[model samples]
Target: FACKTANGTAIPIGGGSANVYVNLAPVVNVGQNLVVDLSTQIFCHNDYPETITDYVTLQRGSAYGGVLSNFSGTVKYSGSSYPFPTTSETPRVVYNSRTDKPWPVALYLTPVSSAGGVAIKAGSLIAVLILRQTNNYNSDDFQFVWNIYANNDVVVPT
Candidate 1:
């Protein structure tokens, strides 16, 4: 999984090891909101079954001066090559703006139905996250981490 700029420029999300520091490149103007797309190349290499579902989990990390007022999220799918029938969830942010800490947010991606399973294909824009930036401090910094989980059905061979 990866986060990209408005023009589809790849933004670094992780480092050498267990380090995921999500930093916005262009300065986020004070009182302005920033929008980014989260996408991935999944279900293609392994050809994971079509009847599988995936989840993208996002959570708040260390927050410096860069204060985030609010957050909103939504999902989008590729018109033609979507997985199966393409059932996804409308992501929502569940956090308390009153306090500093924010709750973890998740987006459920395409899933197959019970009737019949199809073939998995290349993925496209899966979801979007909008962040409201506050605090006019140059040193202002906001950190976050995201993870992807694929629910693939499997059976252990005896």
Candidate 2:
């Protein structure tokens, strides 16, 4: 899914939230890819809400063993009315996918501290999936989980 904001401003989806989740199913194969779209809004008063943080991550596990890793991508805030206020503070990661094996994926989001980490009202966030080089192959079959976290306080709030 691809998310588009007409205003380009960071809109709060939920305020002072935490550990928000978005799941994508099916494992990605050598020739397969997964794509996700996300956005944030203030909902109420922008001043009350502090900041909105977003993150994209992946997890891989099998009947024997498994591991979790973060995905790499760029987050750009743009549009007519949806301009990201904290452009400088936004987090972005670029990942290198491995071609040796198939890995499961997931996404997560965390809320920014302050203003009770209230959700944004106007702006939104989005994630794009791409294939890269990685080394996650084993003899057994595994499962991959993707989750999105949106909230004010959390251990690994992006």
Candidate 3:
């Protein structure tokens, strides 16, 4: 996945699975926005033979002065371009409020299908996240917490 500032400059999303934080340096002004392009190439040669459906629970922290304010339409995927490509499907986002020791905000990305997920076959899949800055904080303010899963099982990096 790629993290880009509102200006389109690429920022490092840290190294390895041990580090899940993004350092948005130079500090974005209050009321400004940051864009993140979450992308991945799926090959599923093993592990369930290509994802039938996928979803992500994206949460934002207030300590970083950022909030999940909006998204750029729906998720995008290639159509019949990669191996095992099926009909294309558009993904959707669902937002949630914060309360009771919970995350400040959350964004749920899933497919339009009643099965409740997105598609990630042998192609590139991307999600656009529009983050609004509410204060002046440094890199630590912007970190990521991902709970990736496949076949209803959690996927942890080795």
Candidate 4:
């Protein structure tokens, strides 16, 4: 199920605050749009009493077996894409401003360069949506992660 981190009070699933890895199916292909519903797939997990925040980080590799990259391709939200990189210190896909609310959103994702300009590349992508209570210097950097994989291949229509 997709992760939901709203509702003011955290721990909707009573999930562990420590590390966790989730393997996804469907072998999602690169450049192939898929609806990412955080509520149904990998829901949010908190590290503290505060509601956790979600951040989508990407890594590339083979189908199911994905690894890290030097940050290739670009990401989009909703149906819009950007010409330039939207993030400098890792792209923060979406942010939840509300303090206590369950925010479940559906996003379309594929690998691409400059909004539909170039495909992210061959090999799969590991999209890790992590959650944390506060990233402040005073608070602990402890957090939780949700793993999802997407395969890559140039879809050549016959």
Q: Provide the TM-score for each candidate, comma-separated.
A: 0.22, 0.24, 0.22, 0.35
Candidate 2 regions with alpha-carbon error over 4 angstroms: 1-15, 30-33, 40-70, 79-158
Candidate 3, 1-158: lDDT as tens digits: 22332223333333111112232212222233322223331111111113222121222211111121211122223221111111232232212212111112222222222221122221221222222211122332232333222122111111
Candidate ranking (TM-score, best to worst): 4, 2, 1, 3
In lDDT terms, how accurate is model 4?
A: 0.35
Backbone clashes in each candidate structure, one number apiece? Answer: 2, 60, 3, 20
Best by lDDT: 4
Q: For candidate 2, lDDT tens digit of each residue in 1-158?
A: 01112223222322121222333322322222233233331111112112322222222111100111122222232211111211232222222321111122322222223212112211222322221121222222211121232222112122
Off by over 4 Å in 3: 1-18, 36-46, 50-158
lDDT of 2: 0.23
> Candidate 4, 66: how far from true, in Å?
8.8
Question: What is the C-alpha lDDT profile of model 4 across 1-158, one tens digit per residue?
Answer: 12433222233332333222232333445445544454444344323334545443321111222222322323333334432123322333343443333323233444433333222334444454444333332433333444443434323121
Write down the lDDT of every candidate, Cα atoms only: 0.24, 0.23, 0.22, 0.35
Each prediction's RMSD to truth? 20.2, 20.8, 20.7, 8.9
Candidate 1 differs from the real structure by a C-alpha RMSD in angstroms, to one decimal, of 20.2
**Which run of 10 residues does model 2 get worst, by summed lDDT?**
60-69
Residues 18-56 of candidate 1: C-alpha lDDT, one tens digit per residue: 122232223222223332223332111101124322222
Q: How much does candidate 3 score in TM-score?
A: 0.22
Candidate 4 has what TM-score?
Answer: 0.35
